[PDB]
Write a protein that binds this DNA or RNA. Structure first.
Ligand SMILES: [Mg+2]
Ligand SMILES: [Mg+2]
Ligand SMILES: [Mg+2]
Ligand SMILES: [Mg+2]
Ligand SMILES: [Mg+2]
Ligand SMILES: [Mg+2]
Ligand SMILES: [Mg+2]
Ligand SMILES: [Mg+2]
Ligand SMILES: [Mg+2]
Ligand SMILES: [Mg+2]
Ligand SMILES: [Mg+2]
Ligand SMILES: [Mg+2]
Ligand SMILES: [Mg+2]
Ligand SMILES: [Mg+2]
Ligand SMILES: [Mg+2]
Ligand SMILES: [Mg+2]
Ligand SMILES: [Mg+2]
Ligand SMILES: [Mg+2]
Ligand SMILES: [Mg+2]
Ligand SMILES: [Mg+2]
Ligand SMILES: [Mg+2]
Ligand SMILES: [Mg+2]
Ligand SMILES: [Mg+2]
Ligand SMILES: [Mg+2]
Ligand SMILES: [Mg+2]
Ligand SMILES: [Mg+2]
Ligand SMILES: [Mg+2]
Ligand SMILES: [Mg+2]
Ligand SMILES: [Mg+2]
Ligand SMILES: [Mg+2]
Ligand SMILES: [Mg+2]
Ligand SMILES: [Mg+2]
Ligand SMILES: [Mg+2]
Ligand SMILES: [Mg+2]
Ligand SMILES: [Mg+2]
Ligand SMILES: [Mg+2]
Ligand SMILES: [Mg+2]
Ligand SMILES: [Mg+2]
Ligand SMILES: [Mg+2]
Ligand SMILES: [Mg+2]
Ligand SMILES: [Mg+2]
Ligand SMILES: [Mg+2]
Ligand SMILES: [Mg+2]
Ligand SMILES: [Mg+2]
Ligand SMILES: [Mg+2]
Ligand SMILES: [Mg+2]
Ligand SMILES: [Mg+2]
Ligand SMILES: [Mg+2]
Ligand SMILES: [Mg+2]
Ligand SMILES: [Mg+2]
Ligand SMILES: [Mg+2]
Ligand SMILES: [Mg+2]
Ligand SMILES: [Mg+2]
Ligand SMILES: [Mg+2]
Ligand SMILES: [Mg+2]
Ligand SMILES: [Mg+2]
Ligand SMILES: [Mg+2]
Ligand SMILES: [Mg+2]
Ligand SMILES: [Mg+2]
Ligand SMILES: [Mg+2]
Ligand SMILES: [Mg+2]
Ligand SMILES: [Mg+2]
Ligand SMILES: [Mg+2]
Ligand SMILES: [Mg+2]
Ligand SMILES: [Mg+2]
Ligand SMILES: [Mg+2]
Lengths: 224, 77, 100, 176, 48
RNA sequence: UGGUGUUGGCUCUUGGUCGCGCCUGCGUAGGAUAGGUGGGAGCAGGCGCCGGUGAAAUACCACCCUGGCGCGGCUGGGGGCCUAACCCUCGGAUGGGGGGACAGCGCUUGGCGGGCAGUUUGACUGGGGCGGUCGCCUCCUAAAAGGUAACGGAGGCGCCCAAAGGUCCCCUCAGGCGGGACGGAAAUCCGCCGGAGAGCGCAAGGGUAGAAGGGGGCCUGACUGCGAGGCCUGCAAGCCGAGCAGGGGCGAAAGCCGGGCCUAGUGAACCGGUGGUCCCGUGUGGAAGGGCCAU
RNA sequence: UGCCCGGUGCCGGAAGGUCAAGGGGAGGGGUGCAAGCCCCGAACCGAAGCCCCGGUGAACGGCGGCCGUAACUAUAACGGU
RNA sequence: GGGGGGAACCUGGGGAACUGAAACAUCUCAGUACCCAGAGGAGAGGAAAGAGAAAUCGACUCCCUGAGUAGCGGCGAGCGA
RNA sequence: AAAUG
RNA sequence: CGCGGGGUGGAGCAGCCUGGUAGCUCGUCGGGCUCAUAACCCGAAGGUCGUCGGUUCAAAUCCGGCCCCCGCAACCA
């Protein structure tokens, strides 16, 4: 054991107000590394209703960094914009060969429409069920690749509903300045709330919390 | 059974204050599409190319050969 | 009416706020009356000497105000315009407050 | 809401809550009565048809079921995913609405009836290339194709051999 | 239009608006600029 | 047709709902039973990482599922048996039979419903109907101001651009004859000759290289309070607009900017919706609900 | 007294899909010093009807098109789509 | 005791349409026409579980005002305290 | 299983 | 005289709204299996997309005029 004296730091009955779970979320996490503050919420929809699935990203005021290796697969001087954007890996239908055969040392994967074709054609099943493939909804496709690449470093993260009807997403680091994460949370909610499938009967966010990468998850009022 | 019978409500274009007529600052002097006439002395023109007086005075139509046609307004001296 | 067009009922009701249901809010209304005309009588004008005179009448609450010169005389009222309050500061009455 | 006098085969419209597409249209004005529009339709998903008639007035309600070209990416649950090789959006079509979802291929380009950004019909081409990964080197024998489906083929066609198969009859139409 | 879409601008935490027209697909995915509010003067301005 | 009233005895039996907690999820392969999905390099022993495995990986934490039992409250589904309401009957009965808390009937719910009721089923139009047409832009007709008809001739629109907008600085075209590696007959280059035949997102027209065209740097005046004075005009609308204030952009400055070279890209009121605002707020305070601004 | 049950009708389907009152109250809000009083309100349980699966013609009804081909021609028993 | 009659007037129980909206359905015409029961020289109404903002008034009916106001309203026609 | 000369 | 749809390899049909892709079946020629012919198996060739214009960077496709095509109507007298 060890979580016991760690779990007492949560009022199982109570309802916090973000902030409340902010000062707290820091006393909740304690490890031999900086834990990332996770967030979960049982949204009221049906997976089986193809339309209601939720795929959308959000640029955060605080948190999120170049803690990611993004690959820009394109044609033209797009590369120049990309490389100058911070495209750790660059190269069109020649790099597809890297990934296609073994290679796999990145997180995100931006691309340009023009070379996008071949991508999903020969990379579909690989990074497809991996959610890495470029998708408009999850803005990782296009030509303005500049801002795009430059942004996956500042604070824009995706979040697609799972099959159980829930969605989770890292809102920042554990040793984060108090009001930053708490503020970084509303940013995440206000965007997911802003994405309600038109025919979603009932109340949307049904169960929303504030956890730490390793341990305790204090449920809160997603309107705090 | 035809394929026509259409047109657009006339717009009533052209000079709307001739040379030697007294105006007031504001009077639109000319309504036109291109720039058949161009701004002159105390004669600014608008978005739609509509020349209009800039000061109380008279209107003069200076023809400038291949330089176009002008409409000035020599204020009352 | 007529033509079968739209009268000129195209123009809108900006007259916003013109009717809830219980009705009209019973509140106190004020009657003008410019000092210009109390000048008619010289004594102690009281909202009544006024109604009976030929101005204000039952409208209730009197608010002497406006144009005209004041006069040396006490004026009981329910209100005064900043300006007449002045023109009366030239020596006269100022029985504001009023009412029991 | 388009009327009828203004229909044309190909026009897609919403009738009886369902999706159709006039395939036969003939203005009818006999005797001195009012004109009439007599058409024949086809559901967009099921094949079901139905000839009907309407007066000159009666409006119908045009629909926007344009047919972009999607693309298979990968299976998942009892569904399979495609993509409009155009705007690269992601469509999770339920196995039912994917005509011949089998005999398909995780990477093949097919067609879908986009109705409000959701395919209601996903057809591949009449015949596609597929690598048989089964069959006994033993004539008209069964052969499991790379997509798990099985097909009847001749002899010479042996394991690893890529063939063609009419996606409507799932019949061996020759080799690669 | 659809790919077009209407939209306004909010003074950053508050009221007022401008109401322009973004343009989906093309340069989109959010957008803010500098513009003057009925109250006080000049600031950023986000969509919504 | 559900819920209730009239409507009552006695039992038999099954779920479903969420709250919580404990389980649970078994094809290859992986020293093995992989529910997803987001975190994740760590949490005298160990664990994962890393390597291998597969579509996915593996710890520890999350959320939440599939299905399962456990208590806590909450709701239902039927199976029978009964007799006394209610119904039907019986050589005429405060009684006997049969049905039986069903049906019938009362209030209420959703639905089917030309059996019946009220109505609607446009105008122009070389008669009507069928066809075609109906608002907006351009050209002609249109008779050298404006305006002007026809089921006269001929075409467009219901959008679009975050640069295709401001500003400041730069640049000048289409074609034609040479001349040139891959190179049509114009890919790129060089030389002349070329005032506009190019271009100006889209129809046509007027316009325009002493830019309205092309390129680049900063920017967002696609300002808010205003609006003298006019165009057009039956009304309603539509269009131009100098100057002032606030607060900005560009420029050294002069200045320029309250969208777009210009004429289409549209929709009165009503009724509602969203913000804002603090204006009214039915004895008082406060709400309910309105109002004004915005959309 | 042939053939067609895809469409409509009627008949049959103790499962599913959408389902109205009503039940249920997470949770929210207006007021009160407070007990309170008063309003919204999600999960979920709620008939028939419709969807959905089948049946059905002495139920409403429906019952193809373009090419080619035979010892002269024609024509087409035949074949193609 | 009752029963039937009585020109209007009265109360109560029922209750239209043509019309107007320049169609029409909500709305209007109108709780009118009419039917039925009853009442009587009259009938109804009538001593506050009222009004409504006034330290207020003080059954009821009836006329004049308030008032075409407050309002109501496919915020239309128009109805109207 | 499998037509004809 | 209008009303709508149609002219794509030899035949019969896709493709046309959503301009850059010629898809199908039979047929044809080549080669196998047979003594041979079918069938059957292997492989190949073939389309000014009805024409004449225009729009576009480009058209089977979008736009107009014609030419043939198929079906529908022509009523009150
Ligand atoms: Mg005409
Ligand atoms: Mg005309
Ligand atoms: Mg005209
Ligand atoms: Mg004109
Ligand atoms: Mg009208
Ligand atoms: Mg019994
Ligand atoms: Mg009995
Ligand atoms: Mg009995
Ligand atoms: Mg019995
Ligand atoms: Mg009953
Ligand atoms: Mg009913
Ligand atoms: Mg009916
Ligand atoms: Mg009828
Ligand atoms: Mg009748
Ligand atoms: Mg009537
Ligand atoms: Mg007529
Ligand atoms: Mg005629
Ligand atoms: Mg007609
Ligand atoms: Mg017509
Ligand atoms: Mg008009
Ligand atoms: Mg002329
Ligand atoms: Mg003229
Ligand atoms: Mg040149
Ligand atoms: Mg040359
Ligand atoms: Mg070349
Ligand atoms: Mg050359
Ligand atoms: Mg050239
Ligand atoms: Mg610039
Ligand atoms: Mg003004
Ligand atoms: Mg003026
Ligand atoms: Mg006017
Ligand atoms: Mg414009
Ligand atoms: Mg410009
Ligand atoms: Mg109205
Ligand atoms: Mg309103
Ligand atoms: Mg509101
Ligand atoms: Mg107040
Ligand atoms: Mg009151
Ligand atoms: Mg009150
Ligand atoms: Mg009050
Ligand atoms: Mg209080
Ligand atoms: Mg308000
Ligand atoms: Mg048969
Ligand atoms: Mg049938
Ligand atoms: Mg049937
Ligand atoms: Mg059910
Ligand atoms: Mg059920
Ligand atoms: Mg309820
Ligand atoms: Mg309910
Ligand atoms: Mg309180
Ligand atoms: Mg049911
Ligand atoms: Mg028969
Ligand atoms: Mg039939
Ligand atoms: Mg012959
Ligand atoms: Mg012959
Ligand atoms: Mg012969
Ligand atoms: Mg035959
Ligand atoms: Mg009565
Ligand atoms: Mg009566
Ligand atoms: Mg009526
Ligand atoms: Mg009427
Ligand atoms: Mg009496
Ligand atoms: Mg008397
Ligand atoms: Mg009496
Ligand atoms: Mg009335
Ligand atoms: Mg051969």
């Amino acid at each position: 054991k060890r979580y016991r004296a760690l779990l007492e730091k949560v009022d199982p009955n109570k309802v916090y107000t973000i902030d409340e779970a902010a000062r707290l979320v820091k006393e909740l996490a304690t490890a031999k590394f900086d834990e990332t503050v996770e967030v979960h919420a049982k949204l009221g929809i049906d997976p089986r209703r193809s339309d209601q699935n939720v795929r959308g990203t959000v640029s955060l005021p605080h948190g999120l960094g170049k803690q990611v290796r993004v690959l820009a697969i394109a044609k033209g001087e797009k590369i120049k914009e990309a490389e100058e954007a911070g495209a750790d890996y660059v190269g069109g239908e020649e790099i597809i060969q890297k990934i296609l055969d073994g290679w796999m040392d990145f997180d995100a994967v931006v691309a340009t429409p023009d070379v996008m074709g071949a991508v999903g054609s020969k990379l579909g099943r690989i990074l497809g069920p991996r959610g890495l493939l470029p998708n408009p909804k999850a803005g990782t496709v296009g030509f303005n690749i500049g801002e795009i690449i430059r942004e996956i470093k500042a604070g824009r993260i995706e979040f697609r509903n799972d099959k159980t009807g829930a969605i989770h997403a890292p809102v920042g680091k554990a040793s984060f300045p108090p009001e930053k994460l708490a503020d970084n949370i509303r940013a995440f909610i206000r965007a997911l709330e802003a994405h309600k499938p038109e025919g979603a009967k009932g109340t949307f966010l049904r169960s929303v919390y504030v956890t730490t990468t390793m341990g305790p998850s204090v449920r809160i009022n997603p309107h705090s | 059974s035809t394929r026509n019978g259409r047109d657009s409500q006339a717009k009533r274009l052209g000079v709307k204050r001739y040379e030697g007529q007294v105006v007031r600052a504001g009077n639109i002097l000319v309504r036109q599409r291109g720039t058949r006439f161009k701004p002159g002395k105390n004669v600014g023109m608008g978005r739609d190319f509509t020349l209009f007086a800039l000061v109380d005075g008279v209107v003069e139509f200076q023809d400038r050969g291949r330089l176009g046609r002008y409409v000035h307004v020599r204020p009352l001296a | 009416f007529e033509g079968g067009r739209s009268t000129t009922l195209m123009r809108l009701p900006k007259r916003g706020m013109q009717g809830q249901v219980p009705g009209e809010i019973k509140r106190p209304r004020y009657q003008g009356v410019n000092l210009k005309d109390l000048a008619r009588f010289e004594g102690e004008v009281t909202p009544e000497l006024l109604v009976r005179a030929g101005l204000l009448k039952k409208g209730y609450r009197l608010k002497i105000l406006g144009e005209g010169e004041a006069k040396p005389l006490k004026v009981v009222a329910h209100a005064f315009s900043k300006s007449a309050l002045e023109k009366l500061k030239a020596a006269g009455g100022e029985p504001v407050l009023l009412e029991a | 809401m388009i009327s009828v006098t203004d229909l044309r085969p190909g026009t897609k419209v919403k009738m009886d809550g369902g999706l159709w597409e006039c395939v036969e249209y003939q203005h009818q004005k006999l005797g001195r009565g009012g004109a009439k529009v007599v058409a024949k339709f086809k559901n967009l998903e099921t094949g079901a048809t139905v000839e009907r008639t309407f007066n000159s007035g009666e409006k119908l309600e045009d629909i926007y079921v344009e047919t972009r070209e999607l693309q298979y990416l990968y299976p998942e649950g009892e569904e399979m995913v495609f993509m409009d090789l155009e705007t690269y959006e992601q469509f999770a079509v339920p196995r039912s609405r994917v005509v011949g979802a089998e005999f398909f291929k995780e990477g093949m380009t097919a067609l879908g009836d986009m109705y409000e950004g959701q395919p209601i019909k996903v057809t591949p081409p009449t015949v596609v290339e597929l690598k048989v990964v089964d069959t006994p080197p033993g004539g008209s024998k069964p052969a499991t194709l790379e997509t798990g489906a099985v097909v009847q083929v001749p002899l010479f066609v042996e394991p690893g051999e890529v063939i063609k198969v009419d996606t409507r009859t799932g019949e061996y139409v020759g080799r690669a | 239009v659809r790919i077009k879409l209407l939209l306004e601008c909010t003074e950053c935490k508050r009221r007022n608006y401008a109401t322009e027209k973004n343009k989906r697909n093309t340069p989109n995915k959010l957008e803010l600029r500098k513009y003057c509010p009925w109250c006080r003067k000049h600031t950023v301005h986000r969509e919504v």
